[PDB]
C-alpha atoms as one frame of an Amber mdcrd trajectory, in Angstrom:
protein
  -0.341  -0.427  -0.138   1.384   3.423  -0.768  -0.531   5.192   2.142  -0.980
   8.987   2.079  -0.324  11.167   5.126  -2.286  15.167   4.929  -1.399  16.694
   8.116  -5.568  19.089   8.967  -4.066  20.038  11.814  -3.138  24.191  12.381
   0.126  23.019  14.583   2.449  20.638  12.493   2.629  16.747  13.895   6.150
  14.989  13.589   4.473  11.236  12.109   5.925   7.887  13.866   6.467   4.167
  12.070   6.640   0.903  12.887   6.882  -2.827  12.074   5.588  -5.142  14.517
   7.494  -7.649  15.712  11.211  -5.940  14.262   9.927  -7.217  10.710  11.695
  -4.678   8.220  11.257  -0.964   8.501   9.232   0.689   7.050  11.450   3.586
   4.313  11.338   5.647   7.483  10.174   5.604  11.029   9.469   9.265  11.456
   9.379  12.228   9.908   8.001  16.120  10.310   5.061  17.449   8.576   3.809
  20.931   8.774   0.694  21.949   8.549  -1.097  21.737   5.204   1.244  19.239
   3.644   1.443  15.749   2.588   3.579  12.951   2.206   3.737   9.458   0.680
   5.155   6.113   1.499   4.939   2.653   0.141   5.199  -0.507   2.368   6.109
  -4.304   1.827   3.503  -6.166   0.657   2.693  -8.563   3.510   2.696  -5.696
   5.775   2.132  -5.014   9.678   2.351  -2.384  11.496   1.167   0.879  13.121
   1.147   4.902  12.528   0.845   7.868  15.390   1.521  11.523  15.207   3.472
  13.617  17.771   3.059  17.182  19.183   5.577  19.698  20.704   8.642  18.544
  19.817  12.203  20.094  19.850  15.907  19.255  19.811  17.540  19.861  23.129
  21.124  21.985  22.851  22.373  18.339  22.290  20.696  17.095  19.938  18.173
  15.345  21.995  14.750  15.157  19.371  11.525  15.237  22.406   7.626  15.485
  22.482   4.998  16.849  24.376   2.398  13.814  23.573   3.964  10.163  21.615
   7.825  10.509  22.476   8.834   7.050  20.429  11.740   8.161  23.404  14.714
   7.187  20.184  16.217  10.559  21.409  15.131  11.334  16.561  13.209  12.448
  15.034  13.805   8.798  13.371  11.907   5.827  16.062  14.592   3.341  14.820
  11.755   1.049  15.749  10.257   2.536  19.248   6.561   2.153  19.853   5.447
   5.783  20.854   5.009   6.305  24.217   0.741   6.595  25.264  -0.574   8.275
  25.536  -0.992   8.018  21.529  -3.312   7.791  19.528  -2.722   5.135  17.059
  -2.681   4.067  12.951  -2.895   0.028  12.751  -2.320  -2.562   9.782  -2.077
  -5.368   8.816  -2.561  -6.577   5.187  -1.738  -9.391   3.228  -0.540 -10.876
   0.160  -2.577 -11.254  -3.227  -5.463  -8.730  -3.439  -7.583  -9.999   0.644
  -8.303  -9.061   2.945  -6.397  -5.512   4.736  -7.453  -4.507   8.336  -7.019
  -1.223   9.546  -8.330   0.581  12.102  -7.532   3.530  14.009  -7.385   3.076
  18.359  -7.364   4.363  21.794  -6.427   1.489  23.638  -2.700   3.581  23.814
  -4.453   6.626  24.710  -5.209   9.420  22.678  -3.562  12.430  22.075  -4.619
  13.628  18.640  -6.796  12.924  16.079  -7.036  10.686  13.007  -8.747   8.741
  10.418  -7.768   6.083   8.040 -10.016   6.060   4.161  -8.528   3.275   1.901
  -8.512   4.702  -1.369  -9.632   1.650  -4.198  -9.966  -1.739  -2.867 -13.050
  -3.736  -3.159 -15.706  -5.029  -0.623 -17.185  -2.364   2.865 -13.339  -0.291
   3.269 -14.749   1.949   6.159 -13.649   4.854   7.088 -11.882   3.734  10.385
 -11.575   7.777  12.266 -11.688   8.716  16.188 -11.630  12.951  14.968 -12.851
  13.737  17.451 -11.218  15.766  20.438 -11.231  12.994  23.377  -8.951  15.303
  25.418 -12.362  17.851  26.357 -13.936  14.742  28.138 -11.179  13.408  29.322
 -11.681  13.065  32.990  -8.766  13.434  35.907  -7.525   9.695  36.079  -6.694
  10.216  32.907  -5.512  12.982  31.221  -1.953  14.001  30.846  -2.004  17.456
  31.471   0.406  20.417  29.196   2.453  22.463  32.005  -0.811  25.409  31.537
  -3.083  23.181  32.861  -4.802  22.364  30.000  -5.724  18.666  28.411  -2.877
  18.106  25.602  -3.460  13.665  25.935  -6.538  10.941  27.834  -4.703   7.798
  28.839  -6.114   4.878  28.481  -7.297   3.303  31.786  -4.968   0.433  30.725
  -2.256   2.640  30.291  -3.321   4.526  33.931  -3.563   1.188  35.681  -2.351
  -2.192  34.057  -5.198  -4.301  35.283  -6.842  -7.432  33.072  -9.634  -5.844
  33.387  -8.779  -2.795  31.051  -5.628  -4.598  29.139  -7.722  -7.622  28.893
  -4.354  -9.448  29.959  -5.132 -13.391  31.542  -7.346 -13.581  33.052  -9.482
 -11.723  31.403  -6.896 -12.801  27.735 -11.522 -12.770  26.066 -13.553 -10.498
  24.481 -16.681 -12.233  27.093 -14.416 -11.901  30.214 -12.991  -8.850  28.694
 -15.831  -6.351  28.834 -16.477  -3.139  27.790 -15.718  -0.562  30.816 -16.450
   3.087  32.158 -13.950   4.143  30.761 -14.095   2.167  26.820 -16.692   3.433
  26.797 -16.183   7.103  27.246 -13.856   6.701  23.838 -16.604   4.956  21.725
 -18.849   8.241  23.168 -16.527  10.475  21.883 -15.152   8.016  18.586 -17.143
   5.453  17.798 -15.104   4.672  14.718 -11.736   3.006  15.893 -11.239   0.703
  18.846 -12.300   1.623  22.594 -10.337  -1.469  24.456  -8.884  -4.446  22.815
 -12.096  -5.648  22.178 -14.301  -3.074  21.382 -17.089  -5.263  19.166 -15.954
  -3.219  15.994 -12.093  -4.854  15.668 -12.243  -6.396  12.522 -15.005  -4.117
  10.541 -12.603  -1.768   8.758 -10.863  -4.292   6.001 -11.105  -4.294   2.443
 -10.074  -6.425  -0.207  -7.109  -5.732  -3.465  -4.432  -3.785  -2.188  -5.905
  -0.851  -1.813  -4.004   2.592  -0.503  -4.858   4.056   2.312  -5.146   8.023
   3.197  -3.861   8.864   7.091  -5.404  12.206   8.485  -4.656  14.340  11.357
  -7.482  16.467  12.734  -9.577  15.359   9.893
């Protein structure tokens, strides 16, 4: 797939990319994307991995790159095989060989930092847009807020990130959909962004799918 990024936010973001399970990384693991700018990359086929976008970034006098949200802690713009430190909104992909069924999503399993959508381009089937377009920070309860130096909410933890327990993370012994039902916390994310995964076993898991090697547009602040 060709992945086309568009930053519709009024602020610069710094996307990160990751191939899962230490399979080969994409041509870039992270880059700068100005407000209203676009960038494209191609994925291998098959590919399994994810994307996010950082905000509040600078480089210190030592050359270390550090961001307020979704920092990947590589010390560089490129994330180099590191994932985002939560909270971070994620765009996730599983693309098989041979034109079969892609699975994709936008997920708040690791919390929220900025809104984003994933839109298939071409392909066949349902090919629904995956999205969290809302400012989830505006409905984030105190216990889940990540605050800025001025007291504003810059990101929202998921209950898994905050508390780490099986009920919220769906780890054993709550490692099946029936044993890990939604909670008051996943509901907050589902209500704000019903077209994004609200927790590990969101009942829309697997319903964002598209056949035939589609391309994808990833839009920040859609």
